[PDB]
Every structure is written in C-alpha cells, then in structure tokens.
C-alpha cells in the first residue's frame, strides 16, 4: 500500500475504534500492564536515580529515568556536580537521541538543566505545563523575560531577546552564555492543553509542533521536551511529532499503530503518556493530521 492508502485503512478503521466500547480504556490498560511486567521483572534498572546523591533531584519519587536510556552529563561546572539528571533519550523515526524528555527543573537542578541543554547543543525546549497547577508548584523558573535583564544559573547566563505571542502558546528567544560563547535558544511555552474530547481544540498542539519543526526541521540536535514530570503531556508532543515525521515524509508504516508507537517510547522513558484522556489526544490528533494529508 502506498501512503494515501495506509491512511485510509487508518481513517477507515476509525469509525470502528471510535464506537467500540472502552476501546482506549482496555487499550491503555495494556500499557499500564506493560510497565508492570517490565517492572516486576526488574527489566530496567534505575540505581542511578536510586542513588542518594540524586533523590533530591527527583521531582516525583515515582517518575524515575532509566539508566539504559537516561542522559549523562559530562560538561563539568564544579565538583558540586554529578553526571545524573532526570531525563531520557527518546529515539526518532531515523535515529536514537532524537528527543530529551525531562522533568520540570527543581531549584536544585536549574544548573544541570543548562548543562544538559548546552552539552548537547540543544536548540529548542518545549515547556508543556504552567508554573502553577492545582494550587501547587509544578515547574521552577529557568527562563528569562523582557526588561528582566539576564538570569544567572551556576556558570550559565540566560537573557531574553524577544517573545512571540501566538494564541495558546508563546515563543521565547533566549540567549544563553557560557565561557565566552553565546548560542541562541528558541524555547516554546504551551499553557492551554487541548480538549481530548473536543475536536476543534487540538489544533493548538499541532500548531506548536508545526512551528517547532518549522524551526528545526531536521534531527541534527535533540529537542528538549518537558512537562511537570516530563511524562504525560511530554510523550504526547513526541508521539504527535514522530508520527508527523513519518507523515511529512511519505513513510507511514502499513501496520502503523499509535499503540505500538507509544508502547515503544515507554521502554526508553517511563510512564510516557500517563492517562487515558492523553492516550486519546495522541490518537485524535494523529487522526486529525491524517485527515489533513488527504
């Protein structure tokens, strides 16, 4: 089957998956289980995060990065450091290390955050959450805003050059400086999460992703993605991108399945796509994207 053909087979099989009872529920139950079996078997050691010297750098005691795929930091900035961080490498359509799913930086890690973005020539960050959620803190401040001068993290110096206001999302242009160097960083801010149920409310996330890749089309450098735990909303923006990567380049598998795609990532980064309502957004979005490729 050529491209357009495999899309039909998909859309076609939508007037079924949609109606069927608890389709996603029972589905999303297989993932939840997956992690379970992968777990009771100790399939993926975590000791690095389990280390005492890192437990404080863990924002959630459950959301823990995997050794096998976590990001190692080497760009030293003092003996007051470590190699550890809370983030994992996530392979992309053509190669590994194409996504860096990381948590909301704590205060004790704004530095590591910048060592990471620097020791991996990161060019884009996508904040998928707000500073405050449920009358509770979620993400610490790592960026810089107009007329605010420049913030100093360890040896890093962040400053703001300009912002771009777009519907439910902003484009902050940063200027991080280190030992004489001055790279550019286009961080993205998304505050309005799509209404998994309402259709016309998922264009914003496509728009964001459409603008990010309208900045770094290729896959030369990793794209940092984070949310409150760098899971839920994080894996959603990775899966809607990865899938659009295939779309954008006539390479959608004949047996393409939002479920296996997600199942996979979750072997590189724990709890990716954390709830049913999210598992439905990925699909609906993928289903709104396919409809558009026609």
């Amino acid at each position: 089957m050529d491209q357009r053909e495999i899309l039909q087979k998909f859309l076609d099989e939508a007037q079924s998956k949609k109606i069927t009872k608890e389709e996603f529920a029972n589905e999303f139950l297989k993932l939840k289980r997956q992690s379970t079996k992968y777990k009771a078997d100790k399939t993926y050691p975590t000791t690095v995060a389990e280390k005492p010297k890192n437990i404080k750098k863990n924002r959630y005691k459950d959301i823990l990065p995997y050794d096998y795929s976590r990001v190692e930091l080497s760009l030293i900035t003092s003996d007051e450091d470590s190699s550890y961080i809370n983030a994992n490498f996530i392979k992309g359509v053509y190669g590994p290390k194409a996504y860096i799913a990381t948590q909301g930086p704590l205060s004790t890690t704004l530095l590591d955050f910048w060592r990471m973005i620097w020791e991996y020539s990161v060019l884009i960050i996508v904040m998928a959450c707000m500073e405050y959620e449920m009358g509770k803190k979620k993400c610490e401040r790592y960026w810089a805003e107009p007329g605010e001068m420049q913030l100093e993290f360890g040896p890093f110096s962040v400053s703001c050059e300009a912002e771009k206001r777009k519907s439910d999302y902003i484009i902050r242009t940063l200027k991080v400086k280190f030992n004489s160097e001055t790279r550019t960083i286009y961080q993205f801010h998304y505050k309005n999460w799509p209404d998994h149920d309402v259709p016309s409310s998922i264009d914003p996330i496509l728009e964001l992703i459409w603008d990010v890749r309208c900045y770094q089309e290729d896959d030369s450098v990793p794209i940092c993605i984070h949310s409150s735990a760098g899971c839920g909303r994080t894996g959603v923006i990775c899966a809607i991108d990865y899938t659009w990567m295939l779309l954008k380049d006539g390479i959608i598998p004949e047996n393409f399945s939002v479920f296996s795609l997600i199942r996979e990532m979750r072997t590189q980064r724990p709890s990716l796509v954390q709830t049913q309502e999210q598992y439905e957004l990925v699909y609906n979005a993928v289903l709104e994207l396919f409809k558009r490729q026609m």
Partner: peptide, 9 residues
C-alpha cells in the same frame, strides 16, 4: 513536589 506524579485514576 514529592507527592508522586502517579496519583490520578
């Protein structure tokens, strides 16, 4: 924020 990210449904 150690209240465990996994506390929903």
């Amino acid at each position: 924020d150690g209240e465990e990210y996994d506390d929903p449904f």
